[PDB]
């Protein structure tokens, strides 16, 4: 329903710098660059033109949504989790903090109040150590 529509739009708007509805290689690279390591154009195009359903070379909203909302080909759903985890965990120890959280959300472009940060980590963290491990993450991101 609409709740997923909103949640994929917020996700899209996380990418989409200039709000026409098409995420370009420019914008995509700007994202990557913001996170840390920075590919070139060609390499952001390989990413784009895989999904691309028209053949225009920017990823559009029903192309974003059909990639994320449906299932995959192989077993790669296991690897999305992993890589989501390795984007969050900057150290690579197995445990996400409040600060790593803040870092990625900085990088994507949320300007959080520290309430929202707390509200977020306390909803992730099951036990009560205040760090998100893999099993707490799987429970979150299905």
């Amino acid at each position: 329903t609409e709740e997923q529509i909103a949640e994929f739009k917020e996700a899209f708007s996380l990418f989409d710098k200039d709000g026409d509805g098409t995420i370009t290689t420019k914008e995509l690279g700007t994202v990557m660059r913001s996170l840390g390591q920075n590919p070139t154009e060609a390499e952001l195009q390989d990413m784009i033109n895989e999904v691309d359903a028209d053949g225009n070379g920017t990823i559009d909203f029903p192309e974003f949504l059909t990639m994320m909302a449906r299932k995959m080909k192989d077993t790669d759903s296991e690897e999305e989790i992993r890589e989501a985890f390795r984007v969050f965990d900057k150290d690579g120890n197995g445990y996400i903090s409040a600060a790593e959280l803040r870092h990625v959300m900085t990088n994507l472009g949320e300007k959080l109040t520290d309430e929202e940060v707390d509200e977020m980590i306390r909803e992730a963290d099951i036990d009560g150590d205040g760090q998100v491990n893999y099993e707490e993450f799987v429970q979150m991101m299905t």
Binding site: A6, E7, F8, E10, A11, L14, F15, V31, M32, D46, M47, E50, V51, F64, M67, M68, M72, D76, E79, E80, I81, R82, E83, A84, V87, F88, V104, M105, L108, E110, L112, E116, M120, E123, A124, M140, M141
Partner: peptide, 19 residues
């Protein structure tokens, strides 16, 4: 939910096209 999930639908989409 919603601030994790936006990021999560986001970040997976990085992971999968990359890896």
């Amino acid at each position: 939910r919603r601030k994790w999930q936006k990021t999560g639908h986001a970040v997976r989409a990085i992971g999968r096209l990359s890896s």
